[PDB]
Amino acid sequence: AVQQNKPTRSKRGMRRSHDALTAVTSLSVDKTSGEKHLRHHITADGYYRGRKVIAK
Amino acid sequence: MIGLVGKKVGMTRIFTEDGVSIPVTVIEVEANRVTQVKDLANDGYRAIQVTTGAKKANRVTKPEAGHFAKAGVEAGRGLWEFRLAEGEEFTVGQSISVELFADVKKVDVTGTSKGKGFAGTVKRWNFRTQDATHGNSLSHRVPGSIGQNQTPGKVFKGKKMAGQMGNERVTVQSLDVVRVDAERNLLLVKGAVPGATGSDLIVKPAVKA
Amino acid sequence: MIQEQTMLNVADNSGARRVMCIKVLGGSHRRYAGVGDIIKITIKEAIPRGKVKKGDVLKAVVVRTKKGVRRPDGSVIRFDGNACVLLNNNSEQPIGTRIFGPVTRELRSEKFMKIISLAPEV
Amino acid sequence: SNIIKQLEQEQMKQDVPSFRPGDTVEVKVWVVEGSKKRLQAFEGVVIAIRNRGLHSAFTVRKISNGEGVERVFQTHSPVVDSISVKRRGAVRKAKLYYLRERTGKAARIKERLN
Amino acid sequence: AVFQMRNVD
Amino acid sequence: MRHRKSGRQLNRNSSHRQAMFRNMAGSLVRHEIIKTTLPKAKELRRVVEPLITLAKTDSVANRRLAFARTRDNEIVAKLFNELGPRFASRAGGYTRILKCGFRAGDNAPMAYIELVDRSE
RNA sequence: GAGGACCGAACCGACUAAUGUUGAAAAAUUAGCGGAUGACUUGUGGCUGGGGGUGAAAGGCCAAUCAAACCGGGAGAUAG
RNA sequence: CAGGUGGUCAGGUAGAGAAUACCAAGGCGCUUGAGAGAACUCGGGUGAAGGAACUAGGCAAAAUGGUGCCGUAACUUCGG
RNA sequence: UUCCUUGUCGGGUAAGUUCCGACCUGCACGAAUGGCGUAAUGAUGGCCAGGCUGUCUCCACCCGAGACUCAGUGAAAUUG
RNA sequence: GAUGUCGGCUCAUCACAUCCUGGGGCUGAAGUAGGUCCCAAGGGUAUGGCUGUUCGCCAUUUAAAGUGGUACGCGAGCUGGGUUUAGAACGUCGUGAGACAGUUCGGUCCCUAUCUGCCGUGGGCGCUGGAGAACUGAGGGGGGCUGCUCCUAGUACGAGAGGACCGGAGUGGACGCAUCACUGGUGUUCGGGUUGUCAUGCCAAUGGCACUGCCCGGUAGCUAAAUGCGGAAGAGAUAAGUGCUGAAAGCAUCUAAGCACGAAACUUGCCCCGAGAUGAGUUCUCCCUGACCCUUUAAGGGUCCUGAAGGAACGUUGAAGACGACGACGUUGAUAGGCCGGGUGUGUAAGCGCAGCGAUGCGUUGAGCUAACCGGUACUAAUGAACCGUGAGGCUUAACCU
Ligand SMILES: CC[C@H]1OC(=O)[C@H](C)[C@@H](O[C@H]2C[C@@](C)(OC)[C@@H](O)[C@H](C)O2)[C@H](C)[C@@H](O[C@@H]2O[C@H](C)C[C@H](N(C)C)[C@H]2O)[C@](C)(O)C[C@@H](C)C(=O)[C@H](C)[C@@H](O)[C@]1(C)O
């Protein structure tokens, strides 16, 4: 249940290869206000698909 | 002879005049059509490719749509191959029907088994559970021993172990057929068949005698 | 669904009262038995004037089960309790002169003809 | 779905009388006797109805010569014949599994009388 | 905790 | 293996789900809008919406059936008397889900939920 | 109204089993258990100091260590 | 830090009761959460047929459970 | 307490190296290093039976806590 | 400067000196059934009672209940009964402390997986333009058991009794796979009954808590105890064996030349995986046909204009799923929820009226309530986009463009 030997830093790095993050790159311009926002998500100003909602 | 693509609808039953209750599984079978005829020349072996159903006109890709375009006919939901009986000779685009099943007597209904997901050693290979008590601790449904000692010193390949179950191709053999309703494209094979309801099926005549 | 170490009510005037299915005849590694399958059984209890005495060992046929007997139409004939007739150990045939209770239709199998002739029901 | 229900309703018989659970109901049963197909009666109080369309069936308990005898019967099975209701009656709770333990006088059921 | 006991083989 | 199961355990015993969705259902009514986690917000739609359907037809019996749920006379009073007629001919779609980014507290998927009209 | 009497909480004790075994805990928790007017339990404060103390006796216990406590010293003891 | 720490105050209903359940006064939701609903593990519920065939062993679970009354054997130091 | 030994016989069980009773051929019982018997008592040892049950035949499903994923913090034994 | 030690549970793997099934020889082999030996490891190869026991004995099965290797397989899988600590006693030994492969009672079984290995599932890249599918099957794995009964036939055989060889048919046991239609289980998300208490001001009606309070049922789903199927037939080449012809050796001889049969073993057939099969294969289809410099002048480095097929991301999701993946849907629209209708379960709601002093009953009423089902429905949630991926695709040789 424990290592008999110490792994190389090289071996440790190959394990980290799948740990890399990927940018969503899915941001979309608002139809009205024109501010950028994530797709299928409301704008911080509350606008969504051009209609006014929330207003907070 | 060639099989035909089918589709599970739901298990039922067909009452007989003698009063015996024989279980059956309804299987609609829209008529197949031969998109292409394979041969020893151009393809190196004789075979037919067929399709059925009605895929949405928008979701069909052009590279796929251009394949059906060669056949001159609207695209099916999918594609499946069937080996020729050697003596057979089918023209391209021919509408093969369920009527062929009237004399098949027995058939092998291929289907994809239900996905049980990941499963333990007990569910997959029917291993018996160990003692539930008598001082037992942290060991019931567990596989337990999986090898000897220093000899081999390795687990054997193909060893029965916990893993993925279901969601794989299977084929029950020599299933009996009862009714062949061409008017409704029904195929009432006797007994249970592999596959989830609404899943695609591939019925073929039994190799067994 | 008879198995090993299973008590059964006596089904005939053999003089036996309580019996137990020590063994299940008919094939290797066999477990369950019922309907009409033969089972050798010990006699754990018997009335004094009966043909059989306590501790006797002889083959016997099941006649009724709590599980019931299945039918081709899907119907099943369940019974409130298990029962069995004491066949002779040497060559079948019931020992008792009267078999109590409604024997099931599945007994129709040549050798069991003597049993079904008794008990008018079924 | 619709392909299934259409196939089932066609096999369904249209001559089944309605009956409340707990009613006394004779159940005629055709059966082979090794030759002649003589019919046989089977009277008994219903204890558990299970309607499932074509798959529908109901248990019919009967206390004969000692221990009782329960027998399920498919509503649409060829083997079953007449399903006459010999006795009007009523009980709360359609299931009657508790009657299996009750015996003799305990098994009484009052008539629905309406 | 360390315990004690004896390894009598 | 689930298979055709519906609803979600949401890491809670059913006795709490009979309560946590009972109180939250009333909060959605009182302000006609509440902020909540996305997985839970979908669960809410199967709760409040049927209650609105009960309000479609006023009767002495239905007023008590509503009382068994939500357990607040102030909330049910808005039903029938107000929320009932207001949806009128509409059938379903009483509310909508609107995701609003992830919570700063632990990257929880926040999602607004609100009534179709909102007139307060 | 007698009892080293009975059932049974507090209180005291720790028989079985699971969990825990780098634990929440250097011996506990959970589900049961024994005693519970007495050879009872407990608060507070004293007494017995190391070949000695105490012990309804296990060579147990004497500050998480006891077939001879701990601290410092002889002592950098000796070690084929 | 799921342990240890003496005394005092003793509400409502049910109950023999300081047991136990629900509540008053009052104090808390226990310093990581949000999800997904695999094995396996821990803590529980139920299970058709059989009822110790399990196992070193009825281990563990299950079951029995209150008050009033009828009635109660061998044996005995005549209290059991 | 008996090595031979699973002594022999009888009882219990379909079958009993254990249990009960007896025989005495007591390797190597024995009378205050007490013999024998004994009502009651026992978280005591062994055996049998009723009831009871997933202990088992054979596991099946469900309710919660981990396991899994995301976010925050962030160890361990071991290691030419 | 530690290799955990008997048995049991679980899980196995290999050998053949073969327990059963198969193929034969010989028989002091009539038949049935045996003896013994050869070939053959494909499959199968008991439950209990006693004892810690393996073993063994007994009871009863079975076509048979093989012999062994694998650290007398298997404690980083389990059990701690045995043995094998610290308590104690009996017998025996010693003056004694103690001891006894003599006995009895009791006595903490640690470790979150680094590598190899295995069961699964992905990311990346290559397969030489890119992409979507259908594949060919090199190779590998899985499956391979068998009784009973009947026909042949009460015939061959035999004095009687008994009772077949070959072949055929039917039906079970054990095992594997698939399935929920039935028969059942579960169903803390459905309905109802009911106990104590609290709360909603109270009557009435509901809800909270007490293991889901205790239960009685019960939809989907899952599941066996439930029901469908599977072992083969055939063929190829053989082992032991049975031969044909035929010399060496005038004869004889199965073999030396040649030729014919011959087993559940072998190769196929049966089912699954599968071109990372780098020996990276085939077939079908789809998409891309712009303008100038720099450098060590070439499979060179870039800019501008272009961004296609298709993929991915996001969202709704799924009888797919640990996470990825996979299938489906995304406004030209049934993917999910809701909704309408239906089904199913619960079994006579709430309210009112009537009958009764009352608890209660009757009528309204198979009523009310219905989760996960089925059929319909765009009410809502799936936004127009943007992202990844380009601009005709090396060299050499041959065959064709009639
Ligand atoms: C709580 C945790 C403790 O573990 C246990 O209780 C288990 C259950 C013991 O086995 C107990 C119980 C038992 C029967 O072993 C199961 C016994 O044999 C040993 C002596 O003690 C262990 C592991 C023993 O090791 C064993 O040492 C043996 C001499 C050899 C054996 N090895 C060769 C395989 C090894 O496993 C031993 C001595 O305690 C380990 C030493 C280092 C310790 O004292 C350590 C500090 C222990 O306190 C502990 C590990 O933390």
**Which chains form contacts with chain B, at 3 or more CB pairs under 8 Å?**
C, D, F
Helix (H) or strand (E) holding B170: strand B169-171
Would you say the C-alpha torsion F78, F80, F82, F85 has a positive or negative sign? positive
In this structure, what are the phi and psi dihedrals at residue B126, rounded to the nearest 5 degrees? Answer: 55, 35
**Chain D window 44-63: which residues touch C at a Cβ cutoff of 8 Å?**
57
Indicate the CATH number for domain F13-116: 3.90.1030.10
Task: State the amino acid at position D82 in one-letter form.
Answer: S
Is the CB of residue B91 less than 8 Å from the CB of residue B72?
no
Long-range contact set of residues C42-47: C-beta below 8 Å, sequence gap at least 24: C43/C16, C43/C18, C43/C19, C44/C7, C44/C18, C44/C19, C44/C20, C45/C16, C45/C17, C45/C18, C45/C19, C46/C15, C46/C16, C46/C17, C47/C15, C47/C16, C47/C17
How far apart, in whole angstroms, are the C-alpha atoms of residue F70 and residue F92? Answer: 20
Instruction: Fill in the DSSP letter of residue B194.
Output: S
How far apart, in whole angstroms, are the C-alpha atoms of residue C64 and residue C104? Answer: 7
The number of angstroms, rounded, from the C-alpha of B153 to the middle of its chain's C-alpha atoms is: 40
In this structure, what are the phi and psi dihedrals at residue B118, rounded to the nearest 5 degrees? Answer: -65, 145
The number of angstroms, rounded, from the C-alpha of E6 to the middle of its chain's C-alpha atoms is: 4
Supply angle C-alpha F90, F92, F95, rounded to 5: 105
Closest alpha carbon to D109 in D88, D86, D94 = D88
Chains D, F in contact: 3+ Cβ pairs under 8 A? no
Amino acid B80 CA to nucleotide J277 C1' distance, rounded Å: 24
Instruction: Fill in the DSSP letter of residue C108.
Output: -
Please state, in angstroms and as integers, the Cα–Cα distance from residue B120 to each residue in B161, B167, D91, following that order.
Answer: 8, 16, 47
E8 lines ligand 1 (CB under 6 A): no
In this structure, what are the phi and psi dihedrals at residue B60, rounded to the nearest 5 degrees? Answer: -75, 125
User: Tokens 């005698």 — which residue?
Assistant: B209
How far apart, in whole angstroms, are the C-alpha atoms of residue D72 and residue D58? Answer: 5
Closest alpha carbon to B191 in B14, B1, B30 = B14
Domain edges within chain B: 1-209
Half-sphere exposure of C44 (CA within 13 A, CB side): 12
Q: Is A29 helix (H, G, I), strand (E, B) or coil?
A: strand
E6 lines ligand 1 (CB under 6 A): no
User: Tokens 């369940």 — which residue?
Assistant: C78
Closest alpha carbon to C41 in C91, C92, C94, C87 = C87
Range of the domain at D23: 1-113
Long-range contact set of residues F81-85: C-beta below 8 Å, sequence gap at least 24: F83/F29, F83/F52, F83/F55, F84/F55, F84/F56, F84/F58
Domain edges within chain F: 13-116
Is the CB of residue D72 less than 8 Å from the CB of residue D79?
no
Please state, in angstroms and as integers, the Cα–Cα distance from residue B164 to each residue in B114, B118, B167, B191, F118, following that order.
Answer: 11, 4, 8, 26, 50
Tokens of D14: 């249209």
User: With contacts defined as CB-CB under 8 Å, which chain C residues touch B20?
Assistant: 72-73
Burial B143-180 (b: 16+ CB within 10 A, else e): beeeeeeeeeeeeeeeeeebeebbeeeeebeebebeeb
Pairwise CB contact (< 8 Å): D67 & C75: no
How many folded domains does chain D comprise? 1
How far apart, in whole angstroms, are the C-alpha atoms of residue C122 and residue C106? Answer: 10
E3 lines ligand 1 (CB under 6 A): yes
Chains A, F in contact: 3+ Cβ pairs under 8 A? yes
In this structure, what are the phi and psi dihedrals at residue D79, rounded to the nearest 5 degrees? Answer: -65, -40
Q: Is F23 helix (H, G, I), strand (E, B) or coil?
A: helix
* Residues near C4 by beta carbon (within 8 Å), at least 6 away in sequence: C21, C22, C23, C24
> C1-122 adopts what CATH topology?
Ribosomal Protein L14 (2.40.150)
- Using only C-alpha atoms, chain C has a radius of gyration, in whole angstroms, of 13
Q: Which residues on adjacent β-strands are paired with residue B177?
A: B189
E7 lines ligand 1 (CB under 6 A): yes
User: Tokens 């969601």 — which residue?
Assistant: B167
Burial B96-128 (b: 16+ CB within 10 A, else e): bebebbeebebbbbbbbebeeeeeebbebeebe
Experimental approach: cryo-EM
Closest residue in chain C to residue B16, using alpha carbons only:
C73
A27 and F CB contact within 8 Å: no
The resolution in Å comes to 3.6
Tokens of F99: 């995701």
In this structure, what are the phi and psi dihedrals at residue A15, rounded to the nearest 5 degrees? Answer: -70, -30
Closest alpha carbon to B112 in B17, B28, B5 = B5
- B86 C-alpha vs ligand 1 centroid, how far in Å? 73
How far apart, in whole angstroms, are the C-alpha atoms of residue B21 and residue B14? Answer: 7
Amino acid F115 CA to nucleotide J300 C1' distance, rounded Å: 64
Pairwise CB contact (< 8 Å): B19 & D54: no
> Angle between the F38-54 and F14-31 helix axes, to the nearest 10 degrees?
70
- Chain F residues within 8 angstroms (CB to CB) of chain B: 1, 3
Is the CB of residue B50 less than 8 Å from the CB of residue B82?
yes
Within 10 Å of residue B1's Cβ, how many Cβ atoms? 15
Q: Which residues on adjacent β-strands are paired with residue B36?
A: B49
Closest alpha carbon to C86 in C113, C105, C110, C59 = C59
**Which chains form contacts with chain A, at 3 or more CB pairs under 8 Å?**
F
Tokens of D80: 């079953």
